[PDB]
Each structure stands twice: as structure tokens, then as C-alpha cells.
């Protein structure tokens, strides 16, 4: 019933069964092949008007509902073009798909505001995205566009507003041998279905996640809300090491820095205010994006957790 | 960022029922004259249409001072317009030689007995549209929020139900409109909200939103920011985007759908991914260099985009080194390495190149760059890359 109830569907695993919306288009095809070689249980997909076809050896359906009924999918990944993406997300919500990962970049803000309105009043479907790279549980389930090979099953939970910057954090934690428990890219859009607190909650309660890396950037106040959640839930007696990097220290105000939501507007959204807020919540902020792995490593060492 | 001339955003408002000064735009002195007569107004305002601010105290190359003039005489509108059109208007915020003026707006000059601030914006923090208003208008809203927070009012608008009469009335009353003017303002607020939705704006700011002595509620000046993602359904509006006052490279970069943002440095850089691009600009600054620009090729990177990026960085003469950091993206490194050396050769670039490639087939990619003969340094990681790029340019 409450949307926070769906937080748990964020944790994909080897048992997660996935369908692809926009399955027959060029993007959907390419990433579905990569999902298949990674070992993700991709079980079919949809494209309105093309059901009754097979694609990549899997069945294509006209609707998400039929696809879910026929395959038992618990997740859906969306690669539909902007003009139809909101209708795709809504169709998944109507079908009560537990987890929807919308990859698509370029969805109108007004369309997402309408989608989020529906989203917040239901509790069955959890949406990650739009404009995000997806979610990956190393060695068990890959939903999205990240390169599978840099990941290594391990101990660090990673949540990020960006795409390729997340790969830096993954690569650095794989190199120092810590690995990752779960990596979630929440996307660079201003209106989306999952924020950092949603992920933090899953991470704090996950025995497999011993440390967290939170990657943020300028714009909005999701990082500041994450710091409050941490002051309340990770300030003792429970306490997992949290390391962060916030992008955009040098960004000029007033410009959209690639990501639709990366903008310092009205003097609100700057990087140092987020860094200050996170530090005060116990977070170790790494000033350099190249030192995320070594920083969280040192935190593990100090707590004698290695 | 869509940029509309004053006359364009006012036309957009008036075509949509929002009350704005009556006005016409002219291409010729003669047209300006005839338009001033049509207006049939007691007092006429003649305004040069350029995007830059400071028109009021600007100077034209004709010798005429002031890009904004008032008069009660149509013929004077024509005479002054003749000394405006075709000439360059220089202001406190235009390049040194000013901007050519192709059009002028001729509008009825209205008095402002009261000014308030009114805005409608997509507020991330409220999950939707919000009506922001303040009776203290004419002033930049930021300052008002600083000194008098108690004077700024906000109404959360439910996107599904739309704006409620109650909400528009309460906002109008909060902005101090009274009696009949209160209903007139409330009604302009609803019209503005519908306009905001219709054109996929992320913000419509009316300042001053006010009343004339004659008891009229008018949107005197407005600024509209559009959602770039909505372009496919707002083609007529994006078509009127004025890119003639933009940084040339920024225009060029747009031709290819490249997000380029000029900065002040001498170390150019291009990266796949906005987060990574901001972090690269950040780490170059942290290691003591000044980035020359922000440039996002996007996460999935194609060889032709690497090529266009080099072609772009070719126009900026400040660039003394280029840092390429590509990580991820569905194309393998060897293809990227190839387009790099090919771009280098064909565009005849001689500036040092610091390259950080990570992904599939990097060994081969490394080989391609080392065997190229070109001044290319292959970095260990981002920190290494920034340090090497900073070491390659002047003090």
C-alpha cells in the first residue's frame, strides 16, 4: 500500500526473472543479449503490435500483463524511446510488476511528475530510474547497461546518481578486493522512483552489505535527505562505514551539467553543502573520485573489519 | 537551453490568454512607425530585441543611446527605430562590439501601480509543480527569501487535479490583490499554470506580475525555462530558439547533440557520462589545473562522437592539452583508440593528449595509442590522468 513498502524489490538476485519492454528495438536487443550472457534470467519482452513473435529465442508479447502471466517475471527493464516511455512505466505499474527499471533518458519532466504521482499511491511496484544504468547483484543478476566484467561479488553496497562514475567506484572496490554486494544506479533525472534513502535502508539492513559508497552530484536535495536518514539510522548503535563522492564542485551555476537534474539553481544544489551535510551524518567524503576504493578500505581497516 | 526574445515569450503568453502589454514587432523603421500608430496608445515603448541584458543603458553604433525608449509620438518611434535596426547594440553584457539588432518591439507603455512576484516551477522537492509568489516584487526572489522568508508564499499543485480556484484566490490574496483585482489575478494565475503545462516549461517566472493604475493585472516581464527533453513535442517553440548570442562552440556542439559547456581553463577534456565529466573537471581543479570545458559524449560512446569532439576542441584556442577519459559504454576501447589517432592525424592536432581508457580490449587499445607516433600519454587512472594533464600545460 505505501510506496516505501516496495523498497525491498530493489534487491535483485539469481531468482529474479526479467522481461524487457522495448525488447525488439536496437537498444533493447543489444542489452538483452548482454543480460543473457551475463546469466540474467531474461524471459521475454514486449513491443506493442509484435506479440506472437520470438526474439533472441525468447517470446515477445503485446502487453506487460500477458508477459508477466506467461513467464512469471518479477522485474521489467524499459528501453522504450522517450515519447512512449511514460506509457511503458504506467503499463508496468498497472501490471503490478514488483520491480521496474527504466533505462530511458530524455523523458519529459512533466511525464515523470505524472508517473511519480501514480507511483506514490501504490505499494506493489518499485521503480528505479528513469535515465539510470540499472541494478546489478554481481554474479547473480544484471538489469541494465553496466559492464558486467568490472564487478565482483563482495561487501560494498553502492548507490549512485550517475552512470559511468559508478563504474569507477565498482572498479576501485573490485581492485582492492572488497567487491560489491549490490549496485544501484538511481539515475540523473530530477523526478525518479528511487532515491538514496530507499537504497540506504536496504543497505543498512543487509547483512551482506558491510560498507556503503554513495555517489552524488549537484542539484536537488537527495544527498541532504540521505544524510538525515543516516543521522537517524546509522548513528549508533548500528553503524556501517559510509564513503561518498559528490560530483560538481566546479560546476558553473545555472547550467544543466548533462544530467537533467544536475543544476545549481537559485543558489540551491551546490556540492559543498551536500558534502557538509554528509560529513555531519558520519559519512567519510572522498574529495577525489579516484580514491573511493582506498577510502572505504581504510574505514574497514580502522574498524578492524578486513 | 531555449532562449526566447522578449517579443517571443510575450507572444507565447498572449496567444495563450495571459495578459501582456499590447505590442507588435518590427523589421523596419517604417513598420515600427505603422505599428506605433496601430497600437493606438497614449504612450509607446520602443525596445530593441536582443537577449543580453542592460538594453536600457546600452549604446548603438548609430550613436543612439538607450535600447528602450518612451514616447507619445508614433513618428518618433519610426525615427528612433531607424537608428536602431541594422545597428549593433552594446551593453554591460554583450561582447564588446555589441549585437546586431534586427527587430524592435513597439509596445503600449503601461504604468505599474503595484508589483508582485509570481512563479510556477517543477519542484523536485515537492514532487511536482508549485506556485511561488511574493507581494514584494520587482526584486530578485532570492534576496526576498534571504531577508523576508515570511513574505514568500508557496502552493503545491497536484498535477492530476490541476490548479484549484481556492489556490489561485489564496495566492492572489497573498500577493495583495484586493477586491475585483483579486479575482482578475487568480484568473491570470490559472492561465499561467495552463500555459506552464502546455509548453513543457520547468519554470515560468512573472516579475513584475502586477497592476496598472487603471485597475489591470498584467504580466509585465517574464522568463520561461523549457524542459529540453520535451523538444520532440514542442518543435515550434524550440525552432524559435535564438542561438545568435551563444558561444559558437556551444552551438557547434549542439549540431551533434554534444553537451559542451565552455569554462575558463586550458585543459580540455572529454568524457563519456555527465557524472564522470563533472568529476573529471573536479579532479583537474583539485590537482591544480583549470578545465577548459565540460563535455559529455554520453555514456554509450561512438567513434564519430570522439571525432566530432576533437573537431570541436579545435575551435577553442585556449586549449593546451586534452584529457580523454572513457570508461564503460558499449564500444570497445580499440575502436575508440582508433578514432582518437585518426582524429588526431586528420585534424592536425599537436597538443599533448592524456588518455584514460577503461573497458573491453584495453591492451590492444593501449597498443594502438603507443604505436601511433603521436604525443599521447596513457594514464593509470583518473588521478593519474589529471596529474599528467596538469603537468602538460602552462603555470
Swiss-Prot record, chain B:
Q: What is this protein called?
A: Succinate--CoA ligase [GDP-forming] subunit beta, mitochondrial
* Cofactor annotation comment: Binds 1 Mg(2+) ion per subunit.
Which PANTHER family does its entry note?
Answer: SUCCINATE--COA LIGASE [GDP-FORMING] SUBUNIT BETA, MITOCHONDRIAL, SUCCINYL-COA SYNTHETASE BETA CHAIN
Q: Which residues carry this modification: Phosphoserine?
A: 125
**Entry EC number(s):** 6.2.1.4
UniProt family annotation = Belongs to the succinate/malate CoA ligase beta subunit family. GTP-specific subunit beta subfamily.
Which residues does the record list as N6-acetyllysine (modified residue)? 37, 96, 103, 164, 191, 235, 255, 311, 350, 387
The protein's site described by Important for substrate specificity is found at 43, 111
Sites where the protein binds substrate: 272, 329-331
What is annotated about its quaternary structure and interactions? Heterodimer of an alpha and a beta subunit. The beta subunit determines specificity for GTP.
Give the catalytic activity: GTP + succinate + CoA = succinyl-CoA + GDP + phosphate
| An example Gene Ontology CC term for this record | succinate-CoA ligase complex
Keyword Mitochondrion listed: yes
Gene Ontology terms for molecular function? ATP binding; GTP binding; metal ion binding; succinate-CoA ligase (GDP-forming) activity
Tell me the SUPFAM superfamilies matching this sequence. Glutathione synthetase ATP-binding domain-like, Succinyl-CoA synthetase domains
Which prosthetic group or cofactor does it need? Mg(2+)
Alphabetical keyword list = Acetylation, GTP-binding, Ligase, Magnesium, Metal-binding, Mitochondrion, Nucleotide-binding, Phosphoprotein, Transit peptide, Tricarboxylic acid cycle
HAMAP family reported in the protein's UniProt record: Succ_CoA_beta, Succ_CoA_betaG_euk
Instruction: Please tell me where GTP binds in this chain.
Output: 21, 54-56, 110
- Where would I find the ATP-grasp domain in this sequence? 10-238
- Annotated localization: Mitochondrion
Q: Which GO terms describe its biological process?
A: succinyl-CoA metabolic process; tricarboxylic acid cycle
The record's NCBIfam families line, in alphabetical order, gives:
PRK00696.1 (NF001913), sucCoAbeta (TIGR01016)
User: Which organism encodes this protein?
Assistant: Sus scrofa (Pig)
Tell me the pathway.
Carbohydrate metabolism; tricarboxylic acid cycle; succinate from succinyl-CoA (ligase route): step 1/1
Amino acid at each position: 500500500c505505501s510506496y516505501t513498502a516496495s523498497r525491498k524489490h530493489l534487491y535483485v538476485d539469481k531468482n529474479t526473472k526479467v522481461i524487457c519492454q522495448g525488447f525488439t528495438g536496437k537498444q533493447g536487443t543489444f542489452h538483452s543479449q548482454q543480460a543473457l550472457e551475463y546469466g540474467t534470467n531474461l524471459v521475454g519482452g514486449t513491443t506493442p503490435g509484435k506479440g506472437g513473435k520470438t526474439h533472441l529465442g525468447l517470446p515477445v508479447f503485446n502487453t506487460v500483463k500477458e508477459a508477466k502471466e506467461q513467464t512469471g517475471a518479477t522485474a521489467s527493464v524499459i528501453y522504450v524511446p522517450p515519447p512512449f516511455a511514460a506509457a511503458a512505466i504506467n503499463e508496468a505499474i498497472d501490471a503490478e510488476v514488483p520491480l521496474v527499471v527504466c533505462i530511458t533518458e530524455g523523458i519529459p519532466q512533466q511525464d515523470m511528475v505524472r508517473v511519480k504521482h501514480r507511483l506514490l499511491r501504490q505499494g506493489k511496484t518499485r521503480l528505479i530510474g528513469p535515465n539510470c544504468p540499472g541494478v546489478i547483484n554481481p554474479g547473480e543478476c544484471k538489469i541494465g547497461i553496466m559492464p558486467g566484467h568490472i564487478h565482483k561479488k563482495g561487501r560494498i553496497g553502492i548507490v549512485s546518481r550517475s552512470g559511468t562514475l559508478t563504474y569507477e567506484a565498482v572498479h576501485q572496490t573490485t581492485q582492492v578486493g572488497l567487491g560489491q554486494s549490490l549496485c544501484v544506479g538511481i539515475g540523473g533525472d530530477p523526478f525518479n522512483g528511487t532515491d538514496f534513502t530507499d537504497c540506504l535502508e536496504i543497505f543498512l539492513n543487509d547483512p551482506a552489505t558491510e560498507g556503503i559508497i554513495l555517489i552524488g552530484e549537484i542539484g536537488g536535495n537527495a544527498e541532504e535527505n540521505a544524510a538525515e536518514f543516516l543521522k537517524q539510522h546509522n548513528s549508533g548503535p548500528k553503524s556501517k562505514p559510509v564513503v561518498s563522492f559528490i560530483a560538481g564542485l566546479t560546476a558553473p551555476p545555472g547550467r544543466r551539467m548533462g544530467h537533467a537534474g544536475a543544476i545549481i539553481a537559485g543558489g540551491k544544489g551546490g556540492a559543498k553543502e551536500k558534502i557538509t551535510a554528509l560529513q555531519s551524518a558520519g559519512v567519510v567524503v572522498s574529495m577525489s573520485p579516484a580514491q573511493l576504493g582506498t577510502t572505504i578500505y581504510k574505514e574497514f581497516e580502522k574498524r578492524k573489519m578486513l | 537551453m531555449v532562449n526566447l526574445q522578449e517579443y517571443q515569450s510575450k507572444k507565447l503568453m498572449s496567444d495563450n490568454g495571459v495578459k501582456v502589454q499590447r505590442f507588435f514587432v518590427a523589421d523596419t523603421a517604417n513598420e515600427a512607425l505603422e505599428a506605433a500608430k496601430r497600437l493606438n496608445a497614449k504612450e509607446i515603448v520602443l525596445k530593441a530585441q536582443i537577449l543580453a541584458g542592460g538594453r536600457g543603458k546600452g549604446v548603438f553604433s548609430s550613436g543612439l543611446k538607450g535600447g528602450v525608449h518612451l514616447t507619445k509620438d508614433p513618428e518618433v518611434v519610426g525615427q528612433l527605430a531607424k537608428q536602431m535596426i541594422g545597428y549593433n547594440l552594446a551593453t554591460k553584457q554583450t561582447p564588446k562590439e555589441g549585437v546586431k539588432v534586427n527587430k524592435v518591439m513597439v509596445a503600449e507603455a503601461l504604468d505599474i501601480s503595484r508589483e508582485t512576484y509570481l512563479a510556477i516551477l517543477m519542484d523536485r522537492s515537492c514532487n511536482g509543480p508549485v506556485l511561488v509568489g511574493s507581494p514584494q516584487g520587482g526584486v530578485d526572489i532570492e534576496e526576498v527569501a534571504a531577508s523576508n522568508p515570511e513574505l514568500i508564499f508557496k502552493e503545491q499543485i497536484d498535477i492530476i487535479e490541476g490548479i484549484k480556484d481556492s489556490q489561485a484566490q489564496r495566492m492572489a490574496e497573498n500577493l495583495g490583490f484586493l477586491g475585483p483585482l483579486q479575482n482578475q489575478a487568480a484568473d491570470q494565475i490559472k492561465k499561467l499554470y495552463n500555459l506552464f503545462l502546455k509548453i513543457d516549461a520547468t519554470q515560468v517566472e512573472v516579475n513584475p506580475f502586477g497592476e496598472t493604475p487603471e485597475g489591470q493585472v498584467v504580466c509585465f516581464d517574464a522568463k520561461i525555462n523549457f524542459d529540453d527533453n520535451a523538444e520532440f513535442r514542442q518543435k515550434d517553440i524550440f525552432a524559435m530558439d535564438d542561438k545568435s548570442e551563444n558561444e559558437p562552440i556551444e552551438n557547434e556542439a549542439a549540431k551533434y547533440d554534444l553537451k559542451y559547456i565552455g569554462l575558463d581553463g586550458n585543459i580540455a577534456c572529454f568524457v563519456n557520462g555527465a557524472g564522470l565529466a563533472m568529476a573529471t573537471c573536479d579532479i583537474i581543479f583539485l590537482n591544480g589545473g583549470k578545465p577548459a570545458n565540460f563535455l559529455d559524449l554520453g555514456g554509450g560512446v561512438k567513434e564519430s562522437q570522439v571525432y566530432q569532439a576533437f573537431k570541436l576542441l579545435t575551435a577553442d584556442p585556449k586549449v593546451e592539452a586534452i584529457l580523454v577519459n572513457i570508461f564503460g559504454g558499449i564500444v570497445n576501447c580499440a575502436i575508440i583508440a582508433n578514432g582518437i589517432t585518426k582524429a588526431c592525424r586528420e585534424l592536425e592536432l599537436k597538443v599533448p593528449l592524456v588518455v584514460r581508457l577503461e573497458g573491453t580490449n584495453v591492451h590492444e587499445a593501449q597498443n594502438i595509442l603507443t604505436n601511433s607516433g603521436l604525443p599521447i600519454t596513457s594514464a593509470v587512472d583518473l588521478e593519474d590522468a589529471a596529474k599528467k594533464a596538469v603537468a602538460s600545460v602552462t603555470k
